[PDB]
Every structure is written in C-alpha cells, then in structure tokens.
Scaffold this active site. Structure first.
Site, PDB file in Angstrom:
ATOM      1  N   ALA A   1       1.384   1.137  11.001  1.00 45.41           N
ATOM      2  CA  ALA A   1       0.720   1.458   9.380  1.00 45.41           C
ATOM      3  C   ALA A   1       2.480   2.229   9.391  1.00 45.41           C
ATOM      4  O   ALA A   1       3.183   2.281  10.420  1.00 45.41           O
ATOM      5  CB  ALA A   1       0.458   2.921  10.399  1.00 45.41           C
ATOM      6  N   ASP A   2       3.380   2.369   8.247  1.00 42.16           N
ATOM      7  CA  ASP A   2       4.700   2.538   7.517  1.00 42.16           C
ATOM      8  C   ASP A   2       4.037   4.462   7.646  1.00 42.16           C
ATOM      9  O   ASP A   2       3.708   4.743   8.015  1.00 42.16           O
ATOM     10  CB  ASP A   2       5.215   1.632   6.431  1.00 42.16           C
ATOM     11  N   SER A   3       6.030   4.658   6.545  1.00 38.36           N
ATOM     12  CA  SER A   3       6.067   5.704   6.650  1.00 38.36           C
ATOM     13  C   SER A   3       5.024   6.331   6.110  1.00 38.36           C
ATOM     14  O   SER A   3       4.763   7.524   5.914  1.00 38.36           O
ATOM     15  CB  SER A   3       7.832   6.313   6.382  1.00 38.36           C
TER      16      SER A   3
ATOM     17  N   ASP B   1       2.094   5.175   5.517  1.00 40.76           N
ATOM     18  CA  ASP B   1       0.833   5.773   5.538  1.00 40.76           C
ATOM     19  C   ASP B   1      -0.109   6.547   6.265  1.00 40.76           C
ATOM     20  O   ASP B   1      -0.859   7.483   6.562  1.00 40.76           O
ATOM     21  CB  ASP B   1       0.538   4.585   6.686  1.00 40.76           C
TER      22      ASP B   1
ATOM     23  N   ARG C   1      -2.800   0.042  -2.835  1.00 43.45           N
ATOM     24  CA  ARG C   1      -2.713   1.258  -2.010  1.00 43.45           C
ATOM     25  C   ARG C   1      -1.711   1.851  -2.412  1.00 43.45           C
ATOM     26  O   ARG C   1      -1.060   3.818  -3.326  1.00 43.45           O
ATOM     27  CB  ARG C   1      -1.954   1.931  -0.713  1.00 43.45           C
TER      28      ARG C   1
END
Ligand code: NA
Ligand code: NA
Lengths: 75, 405, 406, 71
Positions: A34-36, A38, B67
């Site tokens: 998970a990136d920032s 997410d 996304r």
C-alpha cells in the site's frame, strides 16, 4: 460475517491482494504494497462500511490489519 | 536530413468495434454504432442517442493503475495495449527508453468525477467522501499521466487539447518530435468518456440531434438534406508513430507514411467556421506531396451549418480533381477528443485493405453538395494517398495526409 | 543553421502583482502573496490559505469576448494584452497572420462552471437553466480558444496540459514551432482559476498546508524543516516567443534567448517524483550551453518529500559547480498550470534586472540541503544564464534555459 | 421598463437603436447563442416561463418590452 473477516474483505479489494495474504500481523505498506494514497482510501472504505467516524490522528495509527480490526471491535 | 515518420501500429476502442478487426468489419458493412440511451433520457436531455462503447471495463486493468483512471484514460489505455502488440514492440524495446514518448489528450478530462467531487464535499461526510483520486481523474492531462506511468515511458509526455481536433494535433505533434530528431517512437492518440454531465451542456447549446430518438441508427446523417445535429460519442485510439529508419531496421510492418500535416486557425468566429482557415490547413498538408489525394475522410459533423463550409473549402482546394469523400461520423457519432485518432485509423484501414467506407444515411443529397464524389456504397479501390480533416471549437483546424511506401 | 527563439515581450497576472512592474517590486522585497481565504473555510476544507489575484476584472474585457471566458481565460487574456504591448506589436503585425500562433493551456479547465451546469441541470428548471456558455468555460482548451478569436490568430492554436508543467511545455512547444520554421511569432503561456471546487480535491489527498492557517504569510515554506504541503494559487502569464531575425528586423526589445528546452517522463511512481527523469531533463536543456548556470528557479513548492528529491537531482547534474537556488513559490504559491510561464517570467525579470529573488520562510534548513547555495536574501548580481524547473503529476518534467544575447 | 438596459449590456450597444422593428441579428448584431441568452436574462429580472417552439418565433425588441408590461 464476523467483524474480523469483514475488515479483511475490505482490505483485500482495496489493495489488490488475495484473502489468504491478509493475515492479522500484516502491515499495509511493507507487506501489502500500500502506497501513501492507498492508506487514505482504505480508512475511507472502513468508515463507509461499519458506519463509524475515525479521527485522523487515530487513522494514522492504523497501519496493520490487527489495528483496523481492534479499532472497529472497540467501537 | 528531414527525418520521415511512419505508422507501425494502431489500436482502437470505438462504438463500431473494440479492435481494428471488428472496426474493419463494421466499416465494410456500414453498420451504425448509435444506440438508444436511457441515461440521457433520465437526466432530462432532449437527445436520447449516443455512440457508446459496447464493452464493460470492470477488471480489464490492474487495480494499482485503474485507481487513477477515468473512462477517457481507460479507453486510451486499452487502445495503446493493442497498438503496442500490433507494432510488435517488446517491453525491453519501448520501456525505460528516453527515445520513446507519449502524446495523448482528451477534450476536457472527466466532468463526471468533477461533479462527483463537489457532491461529496457539500454532503454530510465532507472531505471524507471525496477520496484522493479525483485529481488524476478530473484533470486535462489525466490521459497522458495515467498511461505514461504503467508503460514506463521515459521520453516526452503531455496532453494536447483543442476541442474536436484534439487527437489530430497529438499525431501532428508526434511527427514533429520525430522530425526534430527528439524521439524515435511516440504513441499518439486520445480518449473521451460518455456521460450526461458532459453531453447536457451540448444539448443546452442546441447542437445535438433530438429528432431521431425513436430510430437511433438514423440520427447521425451527414450530408443529408434533413440533418439536425451531431450525435455524441466516446471511445479511444492510439497510433505508433515511428522514425522510418528505426522501423525499417527492426522489420516493422509499416502502414503508411505521414507525408503532410496542416494546423491553422480561423481567428474569426467562436462557433461558426469561416472556411479560409480550412483551405490553408488543407493546402499546408498537400504542399510537397506529388501524388493526388484518392480518399478524403471529411470532418462531417451532420450539423445544419458546419457541414457546408467544409464542402466549400474542399471545392476551392481541389476544384475539378475532387477526391472520393465520405464522412465516417454517420456510423460512429462524434467522439470529440478521440475523433482525430479514430478517423485516422479508419483511413489507414481503408488504405491497408483497399476499400472506401460509405457515408451512410444519405437519402437526399444536399443541393450544396452536388458535384462532389460523396461515396454512399462500399467501393473496392486501390488507394494510395488518403486525407482526414479535423476541425475544432474556436476555429482551430488540423489535417493529416498519409501515403503508402 | 537551426532557427533561434527569443522572448520579445511578457505579461503576467499573479498573486504578487498585476504586471511586470508590481511583480518586480515583490520579488526584490520578498513579499508573500498568500492571504487568508474565507471561501476555503466555508466549504469545509482543512487548508484556509491561498494565493489569490488581487485585481478587479469588471469591465476590462468586452462583453462579446468575456461571455465565453472562465477565470483561467480572463487571467491569460489580460496577460496576453500586456505581452502584446510590451512587445511593441500592432494588430496590423499579428492579426490575420498565418505566421503568428498561440499555444496556451490550463491545468484542467474550469471545475466551477462544470459544477454550476450540473446543479442547474438537476435543478427545478432543468436544461433551460444550464445556459449556452458552459462548454467554452469548462473545456480544457478554453484558454487558447477564447484567446485566438479576439486576437484573430491565424497560425497554430491549441492547448497543452501536463499538470503543473503545463505552461512550461507550452513555451517549449512554441520554440519548436520556430525551430521547424513553421511560425515567426507564437504566444505561449496559460492560466488557472482559484476556487474551492478545485482546491478541495487536493485537500482530500493531504497535499495542502493546514498547520499555518493563522499565519498565512509563512505557510508556503520551501526547504524549511517544518513544511507540510503547498499553498494553492492562481493567475496567468504569457510570453511572446519570436524568431531571432524577425525580432532583430523590426528592432524589438529582446529579453533573452531560449538556448535550451528539456522534457522527460519518469515512468516510475505517479505521485512521487523519481529524480532520474529530472537529471535527464536538465542535461537535455543544458546541451550546447557553454556558459554556466548562474541561477536555478526550482520547482520546490514546500512538499514534505519532493523538496529533497529535487535537490539530489541538482547535485547529480552540477556536482561541485552548484548554481544559486531559490524557490519563488515560497512567495507566490503553486499556480498549477500557470506556474511554468510565471516562474519563467520571474527568471526573466531577474535576468533582465540583475538580481536574485530570495527563498523566504526558511527558518531551519533541512538535511541534504546543506552544500547548495539556497539564496535566502535578495542578492544583486549580473546574470547571463538562468534555469527554471517544472514538474507535474504523472512523472512529467520540463526545463527551460534562458541566456542574454551578447 | 428597464428592458433596454439589459438588452444593451447583453448585446454590446450603448442603448441607441431600440425601435419596434429592430431585429437582433442584422440590426443589433446578436449571435444566435446570444438570442438564447437574451431570453435567459429576462427571467432573472422577472420570474416567468417561456416554452421552446414559441421562442424561435420571438425575434423582436418591442415584443420583449410589451411582454414585460403584461407580466
Ligand atoms: Na476526418
Ligand atoms: Na522553476
């Protein structure tokens, strides 16, 4: 479904991993990629799902799957 | 030297096909892509027809990259996947390469996510319902930003916007990068979403077709004496623009060479074209081209005004040497930001397979169109040089001339 | 051979001034243009500061022309009016001229007018209340289309969009039009509007500054150890890019020659820069420039991570020969699609008037910033070559190099 | 009757050629997009409603003033 597996379902589709990889001690960043950005959408999907409001100071504390289960279980 | 540019691959997602094979079949048969739209009717519009993409996109793209994507970037992403495979470009041949770029744009981003962002803000949730993804979906360069990252483009990367001439200017801009020696490969195209948020404002101006809602396939009727407005449409497209010597050395399949590119401006009226700008735009693209023009893919919107001003410009350019004319918008509708790259792909399919798609829905040819060779039935013919016009809101014009080697 | 491009005129409407004279005064003094915003607070945002345009626009544009315009097109129009007069051009010289083009874009278009039409479409009136000017105001090519008609541009006419590198790519593509010999004069620039309907999307990502709503003047603090996001801003700018011989023929006033243009893509992370693409972008613009760089206008913008990453790219390109660095965004804010042309004008005024605008609000310099000449006070110095960087979402980069003619 | 002021600022004239037979197109240079806005601006000053097929016939200035005096 139990509270524990309803959170694990949400985390799975938000990050794009299989349900088996979503164990309790797994962190969002280093284990589930998970990136920032997410992390922001993840806490939004939890607070859209159990009808709870999470303060931002506590949302930044939620970095693992257990931390998310513990917060929903406590409220 | 001058450096020549060629087309080595194409990809398309339009209302008449999800790839160049399905598009080729529709072009031959003259099958319309316009269908009835319940969304346009429930929103309160007068026009109830559109050229929709008959394809569900749920799950076709990876989650980590979809996304950030609106519909315009999704159609262009699926089109570039086709163009990469059609050009035979392996990943190590176009990824992490400073000599490989991308120029793709949309007409105006995504009004759907623009309106969605404001609805969530003013709601009871506040910022908690906005999400951190609306910026990439609503901005104008979302098509170029959302595509350059997953495909690891290292060269030039920006979006061009010019109303309905949008993706035409992107291709012309790509040829300029090859001519200037800046790039060896440039992906050029665009995409557009289809929603009531964007179509309703066209209906407020009174430019959409509202008299053929009960028979959708007859709504888009270019050059007919009973036209009443263009049909909104969406989709995407992508072409692989390559330096000639770079393509010959790797054994690439070359569709055609872009031997001309015109880009002018009217500078007269905001809504009504003048004609003088289209002549200079066409004459600019023919300068230096010795072979005559065999086919002309006109802009042909099916509007009561703009349809005749292009015919007068074509008449002044060629005079008696009138090439075969047909307006493919009668089949597909008006895809706005993606019209330039989609119509260039239709023209390349005609040049590749030796036929001329018909300009359908012509029951009575308009009087001001007589004397021209407007093709109404599919004709087998060995074409050599083709041309496509793309006009845009604000008087901007674009023209591409393509020829086989 | 190869045709050369020069800047023969400029115009700007920013948050530190409404012309090049006001802007010049704010640069030499270090005045911040950031103020408090009640609209951002009323809409429910966390950030309450911005860099607005302190200017009344009622009656400055004709009714037949302003009816199609949004705020992004108004700032670009007023900027193009100043640039044409500053270039000494008359309508007989640029109107109805196929050799005169216009390349000016916006970051997105206009979210405010798109939202206004959707609310009217869903309102009690319906389609009748939408109005016939929503298309022209809300499209991405509004800046170029609303400007090419009143000025009767006959050359090239389109908009370029690339996030916050927008107006720098516009200038770069203007130079290419001259190099290819297709145009003699190209007006390049852009504009951006300022409203809550656009800023509230950046507040959702957490990219705005929310800790200094009480002291707005020190909110934008590039290279400070206590930064927490950029301050949104608006405005517009336009420069007159002209071929050298054509400018020297009519005896025009030449500011500087565009001796270099860089444009790259990262292709790695889309929300975080990579630095590798910035190194290639600076080297491509410096290719062929034998004179050293005296001043570098950084992109900066006071972001928690992207500040130090840009600095590592400067050290890799220059090594021990580091030029003077200052981030003008600490004064003006981040004007998004207008930042490129506005930061290019700031570098031109500094090159023309021989000084260096300071990078203000630096109280505690951060790590890996020591070793570079981040100029903190206004230093008077004769410059000959300057550089302005511009980055944007999607890993896209743009770089311009400007040098005096001598 | 402040109709002459709205029409003047809507079309771009100093309020001069305001006769009965003055068309909006060839006398006042009104764009066809302006004729739609000319309707729109009349509802902002007086709350009234006009259908659609009737609006195409309306192309007179005195008719607007008389419509207002009767509404
Ligand atoms: Na065409
Ligand atoms: Na800069």
């Amino acid at each position: 479904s139990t509270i524990e597996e309803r959170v694990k379902k949400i985390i799975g589709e938000q990050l794009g991993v299989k349900q088996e990889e979503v164990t309790n001690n797994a962190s969002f960043v280093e284990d589930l990629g998970a990136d920032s950005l997410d992390t922001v959408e993840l806490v939004m999907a939890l607070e859209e799902e159990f009808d709870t409001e999470i303060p931002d100071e506590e949302a930044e504390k939620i970095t693992t799957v257990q931390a998310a289960i513990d917060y929903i279980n406590g409220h | 030297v001058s450096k020549r540019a060629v087309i080595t691959g194409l990809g398309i997602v339009s209302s008449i096909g999800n790839n160049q094979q399905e598009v080729l079949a529709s072009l031959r048969e003259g099958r319309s892509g316009i269908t009835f739209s319940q969304e346009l009717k429930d929103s309160g519009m007068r026009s109830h027809v559109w050229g929709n993409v008959k394809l569900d996109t749920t799950g076709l793209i990876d989650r980590k990259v979809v996304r950030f994507m609106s519909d315009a970037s999704i159609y262009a992403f699926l089109s570039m996947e086709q163009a990469i495979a059609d050009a035979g470009l392996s990943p190590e041949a176009y990824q992490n390469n400073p000599r490989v770029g991308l120029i793709a744009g949309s007409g105006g981003g995504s009004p759907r996510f623009q309106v969605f962002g404001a609805d969530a803000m003013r709601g009871p949730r506040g910022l908690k319902a906005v999400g951190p993804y609306v910026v990439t979906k609503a901005m104008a360069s979302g098509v170029s930003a959302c595509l350059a990252t997953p495909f690891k483009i290292h060269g030039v990367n920006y979006s061009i916007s010019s109303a309905c001439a949008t993706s035409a200017h992107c291709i012309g801009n790509a040829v300029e990068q090859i001519q200037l020696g800046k790039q060896d490969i440039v992906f050029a195209g665009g995409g557009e979403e289809l929603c009531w948020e964007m179509a309703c404002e066209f209906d407020a101006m009174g430019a959409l077709s509202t008299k053929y809602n009960d028979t959708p396939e007859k709504a888009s009727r270019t050059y007919d004496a009973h036209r009443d407005g263009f049909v909104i449409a969406g989709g995407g497209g992508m072409v692989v623009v390559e330096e000639l010597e770079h393509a010959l050395a790797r054994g690439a399949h070359i569709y055609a060479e872009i031997v001309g590119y015109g880009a002018t401006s009217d500078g007269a009226d905001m809504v009504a074209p003048s004609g003088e700008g289209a002549v200079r735009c066409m004459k600019m693209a023919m300068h230096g081209v010795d072979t005559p023009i065999d086919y002309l893919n006109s802009h042909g919107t099916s509007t009561p005004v703009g349809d005749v001003k292009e015919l007068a410009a074509i008449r002044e350019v060629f005079g008696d040497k009138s090439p075969a004319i047909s307006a493919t918008k009668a089949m597909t509708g008006h895809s706005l930001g993606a019209a330039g790259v989609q119509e260039a792909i239709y023209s390349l399919l005609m040049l590749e397979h030796g036929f001329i798609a018909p300009s359908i829905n012509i029951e009575e040819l308009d009087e001001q169109a007589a004397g021209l060779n407007i093709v109404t039935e599919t004709t087998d013919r060995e074409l050599t040089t083709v041309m496509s016009n793309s006009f845009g809101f604000g008087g901007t014009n674009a023209t591409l001339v393509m020829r086989k080697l």
